[PDB]
């Protein structure tokens, strides 16, 4: 379980918009770990790995 640290606006290419304080489930990462594939209430798609952090 993760929480979003900052807003991120989707730039297409299967990226997902997230809002600060939103909850996220993490499915995995790309090859260099810079991108994270996540699921939120709004869908599923890629977000920056350091825009999120574990919670609990």
């Amino acid at each position: 379980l993760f929480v979003a640290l900052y807003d991120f606006v989707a730039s297409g290419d299967n990226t997902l918009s997230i809002t600060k304080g939103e909850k996220l489930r993490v499915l995995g990462y790309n090859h260099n770990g810079e991108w994270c594939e996540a699921q939120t209430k709004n869908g599923q798609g890629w977000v920056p790995s350091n825009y999120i952090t574990p919670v609990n």
């Binding site: 290419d13 299967n14 990226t15 810079e34 991108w35 890629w46 920056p48 350091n50 825009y51």
Partner: peptide
């Protein structure tokens, strides 16, 4: 996953 790198954190 996007081939570009993501924005740096604010």
């Amino acid at each position: 996953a996007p081939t570009y790198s993501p924005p740096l954190p604010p």
